[PDB]
Coordinates of C-alpha atoms and ligand atoms in Angstrom, one line a residue:
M7 CA 63.4 96.5 77.7
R8 CA 66.9 98.2 77.3
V9 CA 67.8 99.5 80.5
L10 CA 71.6 101.1 80.8
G11 CA 72.7 101.2 84.7
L12 CA 75.5 103.7 85.7
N13 CA 77.6 104.5 88.5
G14 CA 80.3 106.7 89.0
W15 CA 80.1 110.8 88.6
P16 CA 82.7 113.5 88.5
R17 CA 82.6 114.8 92.0
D18 CA 83.8 112.4 94.5
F19 CA 82.6 109.3 93.9
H20 CA 84.4 105.4 93.3
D21 CA 84.0 102.8 91.4
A22 CA 82.3 103.9 88.1
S23 CA 80.8 100.8 85.9
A24 CA 78.1 100.4 83.3
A25 CA 75.6 97.6 83.0
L26 CA 73.2 96.8 80.2
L27 CA 70.2 94.6 80.6
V28 CA 68.2 93.6 77.5
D29 CA 65.0 92.2 78.4
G30 CA 66.6 90.9 81.6
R31 CA 69.3 89.8 80.2
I32 CA 73.1 91.1 81.0
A33 CA 74.3 91.9 77.7
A34 CA 77.7 93.8 78.8
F35 CA 79.0 94.9 82.0
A36 CA 82.1 96.1 83.1
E37 CA 83.9 98.7 85.5
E38 CA 85.6 101.8 84.2
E39 CA 88.9 101.2 85.8
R40 CA 89.8 98.4 83.3
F41 CA 89.7 100.4 80.6
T42 CA 91.4 103.5 82.5
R43 CA 94.3 101.3 83.9
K44 CA 93.1 103.3 86.6
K45 CA 92.2 101.6 90.3
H46 CA 88.4 101.8 91.4
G47 CA 87.7 104.5 89.0
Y48 CA 87.5 107.3 91.1
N49 CA 85.9 110.9 90.1
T50 CA 84.4 110.3 86.5
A51 CA 81.4 108.8 85.1
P52 CA 81.4 105.7 83.6
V53 CA 82.2 106.6 80.1
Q54 CA 84.6 103.9 78.4
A55 CA 82.6 101.0 80.0
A56 CA 79.0 102.6 78.9
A57 CA 80.9 103.0 75.2
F58 CA 82.1 99.1 75.8
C59 CA 78.3 98.2 76.6
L60 CA 76.7 99.8 74.0
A61 CA 79.1 98.7 71.1
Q62 CA 78.8 95.2 72.8
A63 CA 75.1 95.1 71.9
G64 CA 75.5 96.9 69.1
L65 CA 73.4 99.6 70.2
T66 CA 73.2 103.5 70.5
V67 CA 71.4 105.8 73.5
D68 CA 68.5 106.1 71.3
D69 CA 68.0 102.4 71.2
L70 CA 67.5 102.9 75.1
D71 CA 64.2 102.6 77.1
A72 CA 65.8 104.3 80.3
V73 CA 69.2 105.0 81.9
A74 CA 69.5 104.2 85.1
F75 CA 71.6 106.0 88.2
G76 CA 72.8 103.8 91.1
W77 CA 72.1 106.6 93.9
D78 CA 69.9 109.4 94.3
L79 CA 72.0 111.4 93.4
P80 CA 69.6 114.8 93.2
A81 CA 68.3 114.4 96.5
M82 CA 72.0 114.2 97.7
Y83 CA 72.8 117.5 96.1
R84 CA 69.8 119.0 97.7
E85 CA 70.1 117.8 101.2
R86 CA 74.3 118.3 101.4
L87 CA 75.2 120.6 99.0
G88 CA 72.2 122.9 99.0
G89 CA 70.4 122.5 95.7
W90 CA 70.6 119.9 92.6
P91 CA 71.4 122.5 89.7
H92 CA 70.9 119.9 87.1
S93 CA 68.3 119.3 84.1
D94 CA 67.9 115.6 83.4
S95 CA 69.0 116.6 80.3
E96 CA 72.2 118.3 81.6
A97 CA 72.5 114.9 84.1
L98 CA 72.6 113.1 80.9
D99 CA 75.3 115.2 79.6
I100 CA 77.5 114.4 82.2
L101 CA 76.9 110.7 82.8
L102 CA 76.8 110.2 78.8
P103 CA 79.0 113.1 77.0
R104 CA 77.9 113.7 73.7
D105 CA 81.2 113.3 72.2
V106 CA 81.2 109.5 72.9
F107 CA 77.4 109.2 72.8
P108 CA 75.5 111.0 70.2
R109 CA 71.7 111.0 70.9
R110 CA 69.0 112.3 69.0
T111 CA 66.6 112.5 72.3
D112 CA 67.0 111.9 75.8
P113 CA 66.3 108.3 77.5
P114 CA 63.9 108.6 80.8
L115 CA 66.4 109.3 83.6
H116 CA 65.9 107.5 87.2
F117 CA 67.8 107.6 89.8
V118 CA 67.9 104.8 92.3
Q119 CA 68.3 104.5 95.9
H120 CA 71.7 103.5 96.5
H121 CA 70.9 100.6 99.2
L122 CA 67.8 100.0 97.0
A123 CA 70.3 99.2 93.7
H124 CA 72.5 97.0 96.2
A125 CA 69.5 94.6 97.1
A126 CA 68.4 94.6 93.4
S127 CA 71.6 93.5 92.4
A128 CA 71.6 90.7 94.8
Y129 CA 67.8 89.8 95.0
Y130 CA 66.8 89.8 91.2
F131 CA 70.0 88.0 89.7
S132 CA 70.2 85.3 92.9
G133 CA 67.5 83.3 90.9
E134 CA 65.7 82.9 94.3
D135 CA 61.7 83.7 94.5
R136 CA 62.2 85.4 97.5
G137 CA 64.8 85.6 100.9
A138 CA 66.0 88.4 103.6
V139 CA 67.8 91.2 102.0
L140 CA 71.0 92.6 104.1
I141 CA 72.6 95.6 102.9
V142 CA 76.1 96.6 104.8
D143 CA 78.2 99.2 103.1
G144 CA 80.1 102.5 104.2
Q145 CA 77.2 105.1 103.5
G146 CA 74.4 104.8 101.1
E147 CA 73.0 108.4 100.5
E148 CA 72.2 108.6 104.4
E149 CA 72.1 105.1 105.9
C150 CA 74.8 102.2 106.3
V151 CA 72.9 99.2 106.5
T152 CA 69.8 98.5 105.7
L153 CA 67.2 95.5 106.7
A154 CA 64.6 94.3 104.1
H155 CA 62.0 91.9 102.3
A156 CA 62.4 90.3 99.0
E157 CA 59.3 88.7 97.9
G158 CA 57.2 88.2 94.7
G159 CA 59.5 90.8 92.8
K160 CA 59.4 93.5 95.2
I161 CA 61.7 94.4 97.9
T162 CA 60.0 96.3 101.3
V163 CA 63.0 98.0 103.5
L164 CA 62.3 97.0 107.3
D165 CA 64.7 99.1 108.7
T166 CA 67.9 101.2 108.3
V167 CA 70.9 102.1 111.0
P168 CA 72.5 105.7 110.4
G169 CA 75.3 106.5 108.5
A170 CA 77.4 107.4 111.6
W171 CA 77.4 104.2 112.5
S172 CA 79.0 102.9 109.5
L173 CA 80.5 99.4 109.8
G174 CA 82.1 99.6 106.5
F175 CA 83.6 103.2 107.2
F176 CA 84.4 101.6 111.1
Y177 CA 86.6 98.9 109.1
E178 CA 88.0 101.0 106.2
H179 CA 89.1 103.5 109.3
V180 CA 91.3 100.3 111.2
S181 CA 92.5 99.1 107.9
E182 CA 93.8 102.8 107.2
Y183 CA 95.2 102.8 111.1
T184 CA 97.4 99.7 110.2
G185 CA 99.2 101.0 107.5
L186 CA 97.4 98.6 105.2
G187 CA 95.2 101.4 103.6
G188 CA 91.2 102.0 104.0
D189 CA 91.4 101.7 99.6
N190 CA 92.4 97.8 101.0
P191 CA 90.3 96.8 103.7
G192 CA 90.6 93.2 101.8
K193 CA 93.8 93.0 103.1
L194 CA 93.1 93.6 106.8
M195 CA 90.8 90.5 106.6
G196 CA 93.9 88.8 105.4
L197 CA 95.6 89.7 108.1
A198 CA 92.9 88.7 110.4
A199 CA 93.7 85.0 111.1
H200 CA 97.4 85.7 111.8
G201 CA 96.0 87.8 114.7
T202 CA 94.3 86.7 118.4
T203 CA 91.3 88.7 119.8
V204 CA 91.2 89.7 123.2
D205 CA 88.3 91.9 123.6
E206 CA 85.6 92.1 120.5
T207 CA 83.9 94.6 121.6
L208 CA 87.0 97.6 120.9
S209 CA 85.6 99.1 124.2
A210 CA 82.9 100.4 121.3
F211 CA 80.6 98.4 120.2
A212 CA 78.0 96.8 122.0
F213 CA 76.2 93.4 120.9
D214 CA 73.1 92.1 120.9
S215 CA 70.8 89.8 119.2
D216 CA 69.8 91.8 116.2
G217 CA 73.1 93.1 116.0
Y218 CA 75.0 95.7 117.4
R219 CA 75.6 99.2 119.0
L220 CA 77.9 102.2 118.6
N221 CA 78.2 104.2 121.9
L222 CA 81.4 106.0 120.3
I223 CA 79.4 107.8 118.3
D224 CA 76.0 109.9 118.4
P225 CA 74.2 107.9 115.3
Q226 CA 73.2 111.0 114.4
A227 CA 76.2 112.9 113.8
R228 CA 76.2 114.3 110.4
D229 CA 78.9 116.0 108.6
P230 CA 77.2 119.7 107.7
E231 CA 80.2 120.3 105.1
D232 CA 80.4 116.9 103.2
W233 CA 77.5 114.5 101.8
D234 CA 78.8 111.5 104.1
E235 CA 79.7 110.5 107.5
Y236 CA 83.0 109.3 106.4
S237 CA 85.4 112.8 108.3
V238 CA 83.4 112.2 111.2
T239 CA 83.6 108.6 111.9
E240 CA 87.3 108.7 110.6
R241 CA 87.8 111.4 113.3
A242 CA 86.3 109.4 115.8
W243 CA 87.7 105.8 115.3
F244 CA 91.0 107.4 114.7
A245 CA 90.9 109.0 118.2
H246 CA 89.4 106.3 119.6
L247 CA 92.1 103.3 118.5
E248 CA 94.8 105.8 119.4
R249 CA 93.5 106.0 123.0
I250 CA 92.8 101.9 123.6
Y251 CA 95.6 100.2 121.2
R252 CA 99.1 100.0 122.1
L253 CA 100.3 100.8 118.5
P254 CA 99.6 104.8 117.8
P255 CA 98.6 105.1 113.5
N256 CA 101.3 103.4 111.4
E257 CA 102.2 106.5 109.3
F258 CA 102.7 106.5 105.5
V259 CA 106.4 107.7 104.1
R260 CA 107.3 109.2 101.0
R261 CA 111.1 108.9 99.7
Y262 CA 112.9 109.0 96.3
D263 CA 114.0 105.8 95.8
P264 CA 117.3 105.7 93.4
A265 CA 116.7 102.0 92.9
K266 CA 113.4 102.9 91.4
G267 CA 113.9 106.6 90.6
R268 CA 110.8 107.6 91.8
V269 CA 109.4 109.3 95.0
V270 CA 107.6 105.8 96.1
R271 CA 105.0 105.4 99.4
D272 CA 106.0 102.9 102.3
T273 CA 104.8 102.6 105.5
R274 CA 106.7 103.7 108.7
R275 CA 105.6 100.4 110.6
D276 CA 104.9 96.9 109.1
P277 CA 101.3 96.4 109.1
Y278 CA 101.8 92.6 110.4
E279 CA 102.7 94.2 113.7
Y280 CA 99.0 95.3 113.8
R281 CA 97.3 91.9 113.3
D282 CA 95.8 91.7 116.9
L283 CA 94.0 94.7 115.4
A284 CA 93.0 93.1 112.5
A285 CA 91.7 89.8 114.3
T286 CA 89.5 92.1 116.6
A287 CA 88.3 94.3 114.0
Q288 CA 87.2 90.8 111.6
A289 CA 85.8 89.7 115.4
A290 CA 83.6 92.9 115.8
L291 CA 82.4 93.2 112.1
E292 CA 81.5 89.3 112.0
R293 CA 79.7 89.6 115.6
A294 CA 77.9 92.8 114.1
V295 CA 76.6 91.6 111.0
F296 CA 75.7 88.3 112.7
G297 CA 73.1 89.9 114.9
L298 CA 71.6 92.2 111.7
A299 CA 71.4 88.7 109.7
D300 CA 70.0 86.9 112.4
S301 CA 67.5 89.8 113.1
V302 CA 66.4 90.2 109.2
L303 CA 65.7 86.5 108.5
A304 CA 63.4 86.4 112.2
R305 CA 61.3 89.2 110.9
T306 CA 60.5 87.7 107.5
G307 CA 60.6 84.3 108.3
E308 CA 63.1 83.6 105.2
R309 CA 65.8 81.5 105.5
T310 CA 67.3 82.4 102.0
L311 CA 69.4 85.7 102.7
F312 CA 70.7 88.1 100.5
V313 CA 73.9 90.3 101.0
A314 CA 75.4 93.2 99.0
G315 CA 77.1 96.4 100.1
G316 CA 80.7 96.9 100.4
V317 CA 80.8 94.7 103.7
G318 CA 79.4 92.2 101.6
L319 CA 82.7 91.8 100.4
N320 CA 84.0 90.0 104.0
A321 CA 84.4 86.8 102.3
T322 CA 85.5 85.4 105.8
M323 CA 82.2 87.2 107.4
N324 CA 80.1 85.5 104.5
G325 CA 81.6 81.4 104.6
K326 CA 80.4 81.9 108.5
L327 CA 77.1 83.5 108.0
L328 CA 76.6 80.5 105.5
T329 CA 77.5 78.1 108.3
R330 CA 75.0 79.8 110.9
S331 CA 71.6 77.7 111.9
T332 CA 69.6 80.9 110.9
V333 CA 70.6 80.1 107.2
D334 CA 69.9 77.5 104.6
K335 CA 70.9 79.4 101.6
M336 CA 73.1 82.4 100.6
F337 CA 73.1 84.7 97.8
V338 CA 75.8 86.8 97.8
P339 CA 76.7 88.3 93.6
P340 CA 80.2 89.2 92.4
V341 CA 79.9 92.9 92.6
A342 CA 78.4 93.7 96.1
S343 CA 80.6 97.2 96.3
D344 CA 79.2 100.0 94.1
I345 CA 80.6 98.0 91.0
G346 CA 77.1 96.6 91.5
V347 CA 74.8 99.3 91.5
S348 CA 74.9 100.1 88.2
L349 CA 73.5 97.0 87.4
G350 CA 71.1 97.0 90.4
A351 CA 69.6 100.3 89.4
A352 CA 69.2 99.1 85.9
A353 CA 67.3 96.0 87.6
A354 CA 65.2 98.0 89.9
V355 CA 64.1 100.4 86.6
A356 CA 63.8 97.0 84.0
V357 CA 61.3 95.7 86.6
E358 CA 59.5 98.5 87.0
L359 CA 59.3 98.5 83.5
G360 CA 57.7 94.9 83.8
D361 CA 60.8 93.2 82.6
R362 CA 61.9 89.7 84.4
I363 CA 65.5 89.6 85.6
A364 CA 67.7 86.1 84.6
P365 CA 70.0 84.5 87.5
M366 CA 73.4 85.4 86.8
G367 CA 74.3 81.7 86.4
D368 CA 77.3 80.9 88.0
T369 CA 79.3 83.7 85.9
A370 CA 80.9 87.0 85.9
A371 CA 82.1 87.2 82.6
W372 CA 80.6 90.2 81.0
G373 CA 83.5 92.3 80.2
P374 CA 85.2 92.9 76.6
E375 CA 86.4 90.2 74.8
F376 CA 88.8 89.6 71.8
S377 CA 89.0 87.5 68.4
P378 CA 91.5 85.5 67.5
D379 CA 92.4 88.1 65.0
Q380 CA 92.6 91.3 68.0
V381 CA 94.8 89.1 69.8
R382 CA 96.8 88.0 67.4
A383 CA 97.3 91.8 65.9
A384 CA 98.0 92.9 69.6
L385 CA 101.0 90.0 69.6
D386 CA 102.2 91.0 66.4
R387 CA 102.8 94.5 67.6
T388 CA 105.1 93.5 70.2
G389 CA 107.3 91.2 68.0
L390 CA 107.1 88.2 70.2
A391 CA 107.1 84.8 69.2
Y392 CA 104.0 82.8 70.0
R393 CA 102.2 79.3 69.1
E394 CA 98.7 78.1 68.5
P395 CA 98.9 75.1 70.5
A396 CA 96.5 72.1 69.2
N397 CA 95.4 71.4 72.4
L398 CA 95.9 75.0 74.6
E399 CA 94.1 73.3 77.6
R400 CA 96.2 70.2 78.2
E401 CA 99.9 72.1 77.4
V402 CA 98.3 74.8 80.0
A403 CA 97.6 72.2 82.6
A404 CA 100.9 70.4 82.2
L405 CA 102.7 73.6 82.8
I406 CA 100.8 74.0 85.6
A407 CA 101.3 70.7 87.1
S408 CA 104.9 71.0 86.8
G409 CA 105.1 74.3 89.1
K410 CA 105.3 76.9 86.5
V411 CA 102.8 80.4 86.9
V412 CA 100.6 80.8 83.8
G413 CA 99.0 83.9 82.7
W414 CA 95.1 82.9 81.7
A415 CA 93.3 85.2 79.4
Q416 CA 90.1 84.4 77.8
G417 CA 86.8 85.1 76.8
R418 CA 84.6 87.8 78.1
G419 CA 86.9 89.7 81.2
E420 CA 84.8 89.0 84.7
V421 CA 83.5 91.9 86.6
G422 CA 84.1 92.8 90.2
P423 CA 87.4 92.0 92.1
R424 CA 88.2 88.3 91.7
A425 CA 89.6 86.9 89.0
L426 CA 87.8 83.8 87.7
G427 CA 89.6 82.2 84.7
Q428 CA 88.8 85.0 82.3
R429 CA 91.6 87.1 83.7
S430 CA 93.7 85.0 86.4
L431 CA 97.3 83.9 87.1
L432 CA 97.4 80.4 87.5
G433 CA 99.8 78.0 89.6
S434 CA 99.5 74.3 91.7
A435 CA 97.5 74.7 94.2
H436 CA 99.5 71.2 95.8
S437 CA 102.9 72.9 96.0
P438 CA 104.4 74.0 99.2
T439 CA 106.6 76.4 97.8
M440 CA 104.4 78.1 95.0
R441 CA 102.7 80.7 97.9
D442 CA 105.6 82.2 98.8
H443 CA 106.9 82.3 95.2
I444 CA 104.2 84.1 94.3
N445 CA 103.8 86.1 96.7
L446 CA 107.4 87.4 96.9
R447 CA 108.3 87.0 93.3
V448 CA 105.2 87.4 90.9
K449 CA 102.5 89.5 92.8
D450 CA 104.7 91.6 94.7
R451 CA 102.4 90.6 98.1
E452 CA 103.1 90.6 101.7
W453 CA 104.3 86.8 102.8
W454 CA 101.0 86.8 105.1
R455 CA 99.0 87.0 102.1
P456 CA 96.9 83.8 100.9
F457 CA 95.7 82.3 97.7
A458 CA 92.5 80.8 96.9
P459 CA 91.6 78.1 94.2
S460 CA 89.8 77.0 91.6
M461 CA 88.3 73.8 91.3
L462 CA 86.0 71.8 89.3
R463 CA 82.5 72.2 91.0
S464 CA 82.3 68.6 90.3
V465 CA 84.8 67.4 93.1
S466 CA 84.0 70.2 95.4
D467 CA 81.8 68.5 97.7
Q468 CA 84.5 65.7 98.3
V469 CA 86.8 69.0 98.6
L470 CA 85.5 71.4 100.3
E471 CA 83.1 71.1 103.5
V472 CA 79.8 72.2 102.3
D473 CA 78.1 71.0 99.3
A474 CA 77.1 74.4 97.4
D475 CA 78.0 76.5 94.3
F476 CA 81.1 79.1 94.9
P477 CA 81.2 80.7 91.8
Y478 CA 82.6 83.5 92.5
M479 CA 85.3 83.5 95.1
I480 CA 83.1 85.9 97.3
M481 CA 82.8 83.2 100.3
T482 CA 85.3 81.0 102.7
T483 CA 84.6 77.5 103.6
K484 CA 86.7 75.0 105.6
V485 CA 88.8 72.5 103.8
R486 CA 88.3 68.7 104.7
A487 CA 90.9 66.1 106.1
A488 CA 92.2 64.7 103.3
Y489 CA 92.8 67.8 101.4
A490 CA 93.9 70.2 104.0
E491 CA 97.4 69.1 103.7
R492 CA 97.0 68.1 100.0
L493 CA 96.7 71.6 98.4
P494 CA 99.1 73.7 100.6
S495 CA 99.3 76.6 98.5
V496 CA 95.6 77.6 98.8
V497 CA 95.3 77.0 102.6
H498 CA 95.3 80.2 105.0
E499 CA 96.3 80.7 108.3
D500 CA 92.9 79.6 109.9
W501 CA 92.5 76.2 108.1
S502 CA 89.9 77.8 105.3
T503 CA 90.2 78.4 101.1
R504 CA 88.1 80.9 99.3
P505 CA 87.0 78.8 96.8
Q506 CA 85.7 79.4 93.1
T507 CA 83.9 75.9 91.7
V508 CA 83.7 75.8 88.3
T509 CA 80.8 74.5 86.1
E510 CA 81.2 73.2 82.2
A511 CA 78.9 75.7 81.1
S512 CA 80.3 78.6 83.3
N513 CA 83.7 78.0 81.3
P514 CA 84.1 74.8 78.9
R515 CA 87.9 75.8 78.2
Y516 CA 88.6 76.2 81.9
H517 CA 86.8 73.5 83.2
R518 CA 88.5 71.3 80.6
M519 CA 91.9 72.9 81.7
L520 CA 91.0 71.8 85.6
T521 CA 89.7 68.5 83.8
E522 CA 93.1 67.9 82.2
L523 CA 94.9 68.9 85.2
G524 CA 93.2 66.3 87.3
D525 CA 94.2 63.8 85.0
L526 CA 97.8 64.8 86.0
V527 CA 98.0 65.7 89.5
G528 CA 94.8 63.8 91.1
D529 CA 92.4 66.8 92.1
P530 CA 91.2 69.2 89.4
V531 CA 92.3 72.3 91.5
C532 CA 94.3 75.0 90.9
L533 CA 95.8 78.3 92.6
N534 CA 94.1 81.2 90.7
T535 CA 95.0 85.0 91.6
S536 CA 94.1 88.3 89.7
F537 CA 96.3 88.7 86.4
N538 CA 97.6 91.9 87.6
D539 CA 101.3 94.3 88.6
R540 CA 100.6 95.6 92.2
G541 CA 99.6 99.3 91.1
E542 CA 96.6 98.2 88.3
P543 CA 93.9 96.9 87.6
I544 CA 93.1 93.5 86.4
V545 CA 94.1 93.1 83.0
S546 CA 91.3 93.5 80.0
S547 CA 92.5 94.3 76.9
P548 CA 95.6 91.5 75.1
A549 CA 97.8 94.6 74.6
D550 CA 97.3 94.9 78.9
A551 CA 98.1 90.9 79.2
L552 CA 101.3 91.3 77.3
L553 CA 102.6 93.9 79.2
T554 CA 101.9 92.6 82.5
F555 CA 103.2 89.5 81.3
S556 CA 106.2 91.3 80.2
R557 CA 107.0 93.0 83.6
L558 CA 106.8 89.5 85.7
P559 CA 108.9 86.9 86.2
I560 CA 105.9 84.3 85.2
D561 CA 106.3 81.0 82.8
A562 CA 104.0 81.4 80.0
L563 CA 100.8 83.3 79.0
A564 CA 97.4 81.8 77.1
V565 CA 96.1 84.4 75.8
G566 CA 93.4 83.5 72.9
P567 CA 94.3 80.3 71.7
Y568 CA 97.6 81.4 71.6
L569 CA 100.6 80.4 74.0
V570 CA 103.8 82.8 74.6
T571 CA 106.6 81.8 76.8
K572 CA 109.5 83.4 78.5
Ligands
CA0_601 N1 78.5 103.6 99.4 C1 79.8 102.7 99.7 O1 79.7 103.0 101.0 O2 80.4 102.0 98.8 P1 80.4 100.3 99.0 O3 78.9 100.0 98.8 O4 81.2 99.7 97.9 O5 80.9 99.9 100.0 C2 82.6 100.4 100.5 C3 82.5 99.8 102.1 O6 83.2 98.8 102.3 C4 83.9 98.3 102.9 N2 84.6 97.1 102.9 C5 85.0 96.7 101.4 N3 85.5 95.2 101.6 C6 85.7 94.9 102.6 C7 85.6 93.8 103.7 N4 86.6 92.9 103.2 N5 85.5 93.7 105.0 C8 84.6 94.9 105.5 N6 84.6 95.8 104.9 C9 84.5 95.7 103.8 C10 84.8 99.5 102.8 O7 85.5 99.4 104.2 C11 83.9 100.5 102.8 O8 83.9 101.5 103.7
CA0_602 N1 91.4 85.0 91.9 C1 91.6 86.0 92.7 O1 90.8 87.0 92.7 O2 93.1 85.9 93.1 P1 93.6 86.6 94.4 O3 94.7 86.7 95.1 O4 93.5 88.2 94.0 O5 92.3 86.7 95.8 C2 91.4 87.7 96.3 C3 91.8 87.9 97.6 O6 91.5 87.1 98.7 C4 92.5 87.0 99.4 N2 92.4 85.4 100.0 C5 92.7 84.2 99.6 N3 92.2 83.1 100.2 C6 91.5 83.7 101.2 C7 91.1 83.2 102.5 N4 91.3 81.3 102.7 N5 90.3 83.8 103.6 C8 90.6 85.3 103.4 N6 91.2 85.7 102.2 C9 91.6 85.0 101.3 C10 93.7 87.1 99.1 O7 94.8 87.6 100.2 C11 93.4 88.0 98.0 O8 94.0 89.1 98.5
FE2_603 FE1 77.2 101.2 98.3
NA604 NA1 73.5 76.7 107.9

């Protein structure tokens, strides 16, 4: 079967994306923001991402057996907006505009329950026949948590938690309260290790062995004038935090900056001042989820755990889940957030049509790639001089070994928020000055943000405490004795690191470059951060890469077989 999965809708939506399954295989998968250059893919059908999928597979809508959407959108409309006004045909015209998607007839349209879509994106691509399922996000149609049993190709829901008790909204609200912003919860997670936890209840959570309780909020609270509990939970958390925490909310400031010639946005207070709040929210989140995970694992008698939903992006929480006595194996896809429900809706539908889903297999590289000719055309448009090295990977390894920052744009773009050696900025892992240099000079980040390493899977057992696959950087782990001080640029405040392990099959070029680098600095390990400037999505096209390269004080850009130096 050929099944196009979608997420993204013109009214109050985020993370638009499209995924195409052909006979259970990912033929193409990408997020709208990569094409639009607008972060988060807000308020739009995944027009460009879907147009990419179809071109990639050489298909039209008429070649599709089915189109799948990662929410029960009709049910949200009937319940929250007093009616679903669209025929399937009208819904498809919005999701796949005829001016971009010509079609003779309509593919069958499927709406998939949001948390089922999350779950499908974990289970079906895990390569495990059975396990416990834990979906935690902001909110699907109603529930914010889902506990389910995956076995024999089936996903059976055991329990759910109402939206008002969302851990995602909670975490997002705290993140906003600190001035890091609700759109950057990952930064709250990074700040956490710099703070101290005094009281992980936040005077709101009560924890038990099966999860958590929130007596700060009626669990049946509902916004009558919206379709999620976000505004309800926002008012309750903001009021509560202001009562119990010594600092009021951080405010955003908008002022004209004559140096930039623009009105810029800033925070009234340094978010670092809220580090104790961050540490406390992280602890509260972990403890709640721990109970949830223990609870679903015991009920199902499983020892493999599947996690998805936005909160599943909490790599710190994930790393700790994995070391837990109740867990033997974990799979979390690179697309745990709503990005992944296009793929998940497609999988749910394809499985229903009798297809069998292939494991993702240690790569997230499903986006667009570009031929040498296409890269060259982008290069020649700019009139920059460049070379085509006889051995690009050797030369890059040497650049990195010497303390330079190299941009690396190769093959299919990765899907998800992490750069994984398709669109990455590379640097020395062994340098005690590289972290400060990249934070302050290159990626315009706060001094307290850590970086993550890429390393050969072949040496990861000696470097990391745990010997498992870490293909997605979706999980943190402790660093071993020998290396905790050998790799200063990729270690965090709490002695953790967020690793990507690289198999030769998953990325031969990247694998060969790291191998080359290993011969030079002892360990085939480098710093790998996302290839983008502060206000933009990760670069996708060779024009994107060139543009970002031009405004960052980095040393070199390795794009396709070509090498560009500053
Ligand atoms: N449907 C729907 O809710 O979207 P979704 O499934 O994509 O999850 C979004 C949620 O993930 C939360 N979230 C994102 N990153 C997070 C992190 N590192 N730690 C905790 N929560 C996080 C974030 O606070 C937000 O509330
Ligand atoms: N490849 C790629 O995606 O590079 P990126 O630098 O964009 O990494 C993503 C995020 O992980 C955060 N991060 C890195 N190491 C970490 C650690 N040990 N613990 C928590 N967060 C970490 C880091 O601060 C950043 O916010
Ligand atoms: Fe979600
Ligand atoms: Na364990």
